[PDB]
Amino acid sequence: HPWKLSFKGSFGAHALSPRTLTAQHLNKLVSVEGIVTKTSLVRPKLIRSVHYAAKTGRFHYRDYTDATTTLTTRIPTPAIYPTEDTEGNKLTTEYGYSTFIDHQRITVQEMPEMAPAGQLPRSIDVIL
Amino acid sequence: GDFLGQLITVRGIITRVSDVKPAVEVIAYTCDQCGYEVFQEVNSRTFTPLSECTSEECSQNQTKGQLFMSTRASKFSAFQECKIQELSQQVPVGHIPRSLNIHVNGTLVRSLSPGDIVDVTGIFLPAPYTGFKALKAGLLTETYLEAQFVRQHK
Amino acid sequence: PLRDLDSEHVSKIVRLSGIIISTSVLSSRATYLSIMCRNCRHTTSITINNFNSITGNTVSLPRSCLSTIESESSMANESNIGDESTKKNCGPDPYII
Amino acid sequence: SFDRPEIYSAPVLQGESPNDDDNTEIIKSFKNFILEFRLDSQFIYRDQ
């Protein structure tokens, strides 16, 4: 089980609007406010597969990872969506036991009540 | 996104129901020299035709034959897709109705008239796609809803 | 007789008769070997049958990770998204017996 | 995220069969040679 945190603040003079964000503030912990546009659609992401075998009758198993995982880095190893184990047997997949976890990204513009007189806005984007 | 695979039930108003056109399931070739009938199953959206032979007689010989298809020996199935919009009575205070696709196969076709109130019950599968190439993180899946049995109000 | 063997007799059935001087040590060829890509994590199998083509060899391990020749969509999807904008490669000769 | 398709066959119709004495239907003579031989007065290969 994950048991994540929050960090409600009170932040340390990192109260900055996304006009003044980049780039020597990079890879730190930053608090940003603004308007939300242009929120995309909700799509489910795959993590763990489960396969039924025929005819020996054993389930199987596989994991998957990405770059938007926990915040460190890791030497990446891709992994084919499996089929035909050793020895050669058809692997009919399944659903219902294979997990799925949702995913959504929104972008943030700076505030119009806080903006300069007339200039183009500049914006960043957030993964949830 | 934790119901993928179960057998659920929705309700809403059908909008934009399309036409009925045949979609292929297995494709039947003839070999003309060996005399076999080499089948092929198609699961995906797009397929590709094939070449010389894959039998047990036009294989292990020097002179492979050449095969070409035929349409009175394949297996077809009707196919029609539509969309469910939210009922607009079961919404929170400040929101907008969403949507969710439906494929329909087989005998159940021609029972989805536009502008109704319906209770579709079906199972809920994935089907692979993501949008722009620069937005993918792997292995985003983009769901739909298979249909099983359709019960109308009114 | 062993004295007269022209090059006209190349690859025919020819019998003879002599005296055997000395044998050698029992070796080990392979007939069924099952492989794995060390990057892609793929599996295959290879059977070979006729195994006296001494400095040929009879077969080698293939020299590409062999998954890009696939008739499926999502297998081409994960083999496409091994990296972020360029395609992946097990290559060069990646396999392991 | 489906699984792979399959290819198979079934013999239905004959058939361009002169037959030209090629890679197959030589093997018909050896299935006729091991089984369907008997020298006088006893078949020898099947028992071996």
Side-chain angles (χ1 to χ4, degrees):
Chain A
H1 292 170
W3 289 97
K4 306 290 180 65
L5 298 183
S6 82
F7 298 107
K8 182 260 303 300
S10 303
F11 289 98
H14 288 295
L16 63 152
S17 183
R19 186 167 183 84
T20 172
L21 191 63
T22 61
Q24 58 91 25
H25 284 167
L26 205 145
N27 202 358
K28 290 177 167 61
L29 189 140
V30 177
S31 68
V32 173
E33 65 267 14
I35 309 296
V36 170
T37 162
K38 48 174 72 175
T39 297
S40 295
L41 196 150
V42 176
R43 291 186 178 92
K45 183 181 176 69
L46 193 146
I47 286 176
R48 171 178 292 174
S49 172
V50 160
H51 302 278
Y52 180 72
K55 299 294 289 184
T56 69
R58 293 183 179 91
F59 289 163
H60 286 287
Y61 181 54
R62 181 59 79 91
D63 288 333
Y64 293 96
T65 56
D66 53 345
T68 63
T69 180
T70 66
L71 217 142
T72 61
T73 67
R74 184 180 291 114
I75 295 99
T77 56
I80 302 297
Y81 189 83
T83 284
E84 286 286 331
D85 58 343
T86 61
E87 70 275 16
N89 286 318
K90 186 66 65 62
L91 287 172
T92 71
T93 71
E94 276 185 347
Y95 306 97
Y97 305 104
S98 62
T99 61
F100 286 103
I101 278 176
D102 308 337
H103 180 271
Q104 182 191 6
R105 54 183 291 162
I106 53 102
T107 71
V108 171
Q109 180 184 356
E110 80 260 14
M111 186 73 75
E113 299 174 355
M114 186 63 204
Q119 289 173 1
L120 278 83
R122 296 179 297 169
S123 64
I124 48 97
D125 49 344
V126 174
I127 297 169
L128 291 182
Chain B
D2 294 330
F3 289 161
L4 275 75
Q6 305 186 3
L7 190 145
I8 62 172
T9 297
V10 295
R11 62 172 62 193
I13 297 102
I14 294 172
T15 306
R16 183 64 65 84
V17 56
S18 69
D19 292 333
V20 42
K21 285 173 74 175
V24 71
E25 179 63 38
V26 292
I27 314 165
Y29 300 103
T30 64
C31 194
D32 199 14
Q33 176 179 357
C34 285
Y36 282 90
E37 291 281 330
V38 180
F39 290 97
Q40 181 183 6
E41 195 176 4
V42 170
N43 281 316
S44 176
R45 176 63 65 193
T46 71
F47 71 102
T48 165
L50 60 96
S51 295
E52 61 275 23
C53 187
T54 326
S55 301
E56 60 181 359
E57 184 181 359
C58 287
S59 179
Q60 77 263 15
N61 292 328
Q62 296 294 320
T63 63
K64 277 83 171 176
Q66 187 184 3
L67 38 82
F68 55 89
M69 65 181 69
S70 66
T71 62
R72 299 294 290 275
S74 62
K75 181 164 71 70
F76 285 156
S77 63
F79 182 77
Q80 190 185 13
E81 64 177 358
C82 61
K83 292 193 292 294
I84 290 291
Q85 193 175 0
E86 176 59 38
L87 186 60
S88 69
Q89 192 272 128
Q90 297 169 352
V91 185
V93 287
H95 298 167
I96 292 168
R98 295 188 191 274
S99 66
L100 175 139
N101 299 325
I102 284 177
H103 295 292
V104 170
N105 287 320
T107 307
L108 192 145
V109 74
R110 290 182 182 90
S111 178
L112 299 177
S113 298
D116 290 330
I117 293 169
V118 78
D119 290 334
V120 181
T121 69
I123 48 100
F124 182 75
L125 306 181
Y129 178 77
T130 185
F132 293 146
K133 183 66 176 175
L135 274 72
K136 190 180 197 292
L139 284 79
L140 277 73
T141 49
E142 191 263 334
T143 174
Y144 69 89
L145 171 60
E146 185 77 28
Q148 288 295 109
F149 176 73
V150 170
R151 178 177 176 85
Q152 296 182 0
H153 306 293
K154 296 173 68 177
Chain C
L2 189 59
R3 301 294 298 168
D4 288 330
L5 287 174
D6 293 328
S7 70
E8 69 185 3
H9 296 285
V10 167
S11 70
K12 287 187 173 66
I13 292 173
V14 163
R15 70 190 59 81
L16 49 95
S17 59
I19 290 170
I20 295 169
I21 297 170
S22 67
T23 70
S24 175
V25 183
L26 294 178
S27 61
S28 65
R29 295 287 180 88
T31 59
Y32 178 75
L33 48 90
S34 62
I35 336 172
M36 183 179 286
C37 214
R38 70 169 68 85
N39 291 320
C40 313
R41 196 75 65 85
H42 197 276
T43 61
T44 57
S45 65
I46 284 179
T47 67
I48 55 173
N49 47 4
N50 293 318
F51 59 96
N52 285 316
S53 68
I54 310 300
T55 69
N57 288 313
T58 295
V59 81
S60 295
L61 303 172
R63 74 279 304 273
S64 65
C65 198
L66 196 272
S67 172
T68 62
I69 305 99
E70 178 64 32
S71 180
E72 215 277 340
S73 67
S74 179
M75 280 74 167
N77 195 2
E78 179 65 25
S79 74
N80 196 3
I81 202 62
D83 296 330
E84 61 271 11
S85 296
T86 64
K87 70 177 177 64
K88 63 102 176 181
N89 197 358
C90 271
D93 47 352
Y95 276 99
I96 289 170
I97 294 173
Chain D
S1 68
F2 288 159
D3 44 349
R4 67 178 179 90
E6 294 84 0
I7 296 168
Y8 48 87
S9 67
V12 173
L13 190 64
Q14 63 174 354
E16 191 265 328
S17 174
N19 203 0
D20 202 74
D21 290 333
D22 291 335
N23 199 6
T24 61
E25 311 299 323
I26 278 173
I27 304 170
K28 66 175 284 187
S29 68
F30 285 89
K31 191 176 286 188
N32 284 320
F33 177 71
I34 294 172
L35 295 177
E36 295 293 330
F37 182 71
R38 179 171 293 113
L39 69 90
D40 291 329
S41 297
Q42 190 67 44
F43 59 95
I44 62 170
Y45 284 158
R46 184 175 180 176
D47 287 328
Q48 183 185 1

